[PDB]
Amino acid sequence: AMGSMERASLIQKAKLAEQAERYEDMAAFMKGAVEKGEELSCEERNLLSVAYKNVVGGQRAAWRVLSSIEQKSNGPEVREYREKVETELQGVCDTVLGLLDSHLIKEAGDAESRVFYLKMKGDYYRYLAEVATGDDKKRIIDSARSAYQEAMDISKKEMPPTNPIRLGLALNFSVFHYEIANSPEEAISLAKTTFDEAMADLHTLSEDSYKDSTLIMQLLRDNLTLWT
Amino acid sequence: AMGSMERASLIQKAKLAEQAERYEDMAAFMKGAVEKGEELSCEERNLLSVAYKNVVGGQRAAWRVLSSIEQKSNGPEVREYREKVETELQGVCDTVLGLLDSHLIKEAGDAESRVFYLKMKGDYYRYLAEVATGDDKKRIIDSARSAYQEAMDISKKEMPPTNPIRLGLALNFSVFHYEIANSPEEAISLAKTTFDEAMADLHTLSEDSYKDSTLIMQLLRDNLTLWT
Amino acid sequence: AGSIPGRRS
Amino acid sequence: AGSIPGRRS
Ligand SMILES: *Cc1ccc(S(=O)(=O)N2CCNC(=O)C2)cc1
Ligand SMILES: *Cc1ccc(S(=O)(=O)N2CCNC(=O)C2)cc1
Ligand SMILES: [Cl-]
Ligand SMILES: [Cl-]
Numbered sequence: 001a002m003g004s005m006e007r008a009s010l011i012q013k014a015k016l017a018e019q020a021e022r023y024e025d026m027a028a029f030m031k032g033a034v035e036k037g038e039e040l041s042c043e044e045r046n047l048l049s050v051a052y053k054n055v056v057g058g059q060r061a062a063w064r065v066l067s068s069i070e071q072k073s074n075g076p077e078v079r080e081y082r083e084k085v086e087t088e089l090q091g092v093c094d095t096v097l098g099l100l101d102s103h104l105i106k107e108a109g110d111a112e113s114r115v116f117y118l119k120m121k122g123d124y125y126r127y128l129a130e131v132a133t134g135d136d137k138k139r140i141i142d143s144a145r146s147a148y149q150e151a152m153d154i155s156k157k158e159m160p161p162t163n164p165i166r167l168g169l170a171l172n173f174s175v176f177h178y179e180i181a182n183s184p185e186e187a188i189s190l191a192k193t194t195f196d197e198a199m200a201d202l203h204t205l206s207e208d209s210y211k212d213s214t215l216i217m218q219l220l221r222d223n224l225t226l227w228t
Numbered sequence: 229a230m231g232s233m234e235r236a237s238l239i240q241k242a243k244l245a246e247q248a249e250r251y252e253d254m255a256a257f258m259k260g261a262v263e264k265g266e267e268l269s270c271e272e273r274n275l276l277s278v279a280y281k282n283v284v285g286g287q288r289a290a291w292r293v294l295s296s297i298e299q300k301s302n303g304p305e306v307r308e309y310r311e312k313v314e315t316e317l318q319g320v321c322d323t324v325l326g327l328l329d330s331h332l333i334k335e336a337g338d339a340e341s342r343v344f345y346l347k348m349k350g351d352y353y354r355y356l357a358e359v360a361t362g363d364d365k366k367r368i369i370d371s372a373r374s375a376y377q378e379a380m381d382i383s384k385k386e387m388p389p390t391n392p393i394r395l396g397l398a399l400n401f402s403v404f405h406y407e408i409a410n411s412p413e414e415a416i417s418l419a420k421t422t423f424d425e426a427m428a429d430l431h432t433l434s435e436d437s438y439k440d441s442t443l444i445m446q447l448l449r450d451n452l453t454l455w456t
Numbered sequence: 457a458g459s460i461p462g463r464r465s
Numbered sequence: 466a467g468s469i470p471g472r473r474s
């Protein structure tokens with residue numbers, strides 16, 4: 001779709017689409033930018049992630065509304081429309097996963113980029129798992145777990161415990177344990193250890209880095225308060 | 229697109245899409261329902277209007293963000309992307325206008341339905357006028373004015389001054405005068421006369437009708453406070 | 457200047 | 466339980 005537009009113009013337009021709250025456009029611009037074949041900078045990776053998180057976030061919210069109505073009802077219309085939204089959501093997750101597999105992850109050698117993309121891979125398999133039913137659920141769950149675990153292993157070797165990507169990875173992997181894997185104790189353990197190890201490293205940070213890390217720490221604490 | 233789905237199923241799905249905040253889907257379901265060729269009930273007319281007002285409202289908000297960035301900048305990217313959003317917006321307005329012309333207005337004989345559709349026609353020409361430049365602007369402005377004026381003439385003959393559609397028509401025609409036609413004094417006059425004539429008819433209303441009419445009266449007052 | 461929001465049935 | 470909102474650059 002975007003093959004005739006310059007990479008730099010796609011990135012420029014993704015930033016404008018964010019300002020305009022046009023997240024489907026933003027995601028299509030950033031897909032086009034990935035498909036140019038070059039690696040993404042830190043800022044570009046964040047544009048890609050913001051675009052798709054907004055698109056899939058709206059789909060997930062709609063799927064949950066429809067699934068709730070369908071469960072209460074238990075004609076074909078509610079199920080048919082939940083299925084339509086579900087298929088669209090799955091298609092977006094498959095598109096993101098396909099960008100990561102062709103070829104963002106394999107070309108990502110620095111820890112910052114490789115962890116970022118593996119966290120994305122865990123997230124989009126987790127969104128697939130949210131709507132999956134049965135044994136399909138099992139293999140999809142294991143794919144999320146494996147991506148998050150590889151990201152965790154790299155992050156713990158290569159990043160300080162306050163790094164925001166390391167923190168957000170741990171947060172989202174703890175949500176995976178709590179909400180998807182039926183492992184609330186593993187979720188609580190991971191959130192507590194992550195919080196405590198970040199706290200002990202705050203003294204090393206500038207004022208601005210302190211603000212970035214403490215914001216995500218508060219999200220870990222907010223989950224611990226809900227879970228305990 | 230929706231030719232194979234039953235009318236009643238399209239209406240059912242439009243209501244689900246509203247609950248899910250899936251307004252593009254809602255608009256496509258209600259377009260499909262209109263294209264079945266039957267007249268719309270009061271509730272169905274409101275579903276059609278809500279769906280398109282949400283779709284075009286998001287487009288207008290994005291167009292204004294982009295137009296503001298473009299004006300401040302005065303490469304081709306901001307203009308190109310504003311043009312893309314503008315063309316999409318125009319296409320949605322043309323789709324709504326085409327439903328009204330084929331064949332909702334001509335089949336609408338009761339005052340309630342005919343006024344409702346003529347107000348819509350004025351609104352969607354007004355949204356076209358917001359993005360139009362030059363003499364195109366003039367004919368588009370006159371098309372909005374003519375639709376609103378015909379709706380006004382019917383409403384004043386056939387509806388009480390507290391009727392919510394009559395009130396919302398007058399509100400939106402006053403915005404047309406203020407924002408599009410460069411006639412602020414006509415806007416203020418219309419809003420004041422509409423408010424005063426509704427106030428004098430409130431005594432005739434039930435508690436629930438009173439609440440419906442006074443809500444729109446407050447919108448007229450809010451504009452008068454901003455304009456005076 | 458506000459028109460009818462018109463965005464909720 | 467909240468994940469990273471992740472919706473604003
Ligand atoms: C998954 C995730 C982790 C951290 C963040 S963030 O700290 O809000 N931030 C976004 C902007 N640029 C960054 O490097 C990190 C968001 C998502
Ligand atoms: C254009 C317009 C006028 C009035 C309304 S409303 O009073 O909010 N209402 C919507 C629900 N059903 C109605 O008949 C009127 C909205 C838009
Ligand atoms: Cl590399
Ligand atoms: Cl008729």
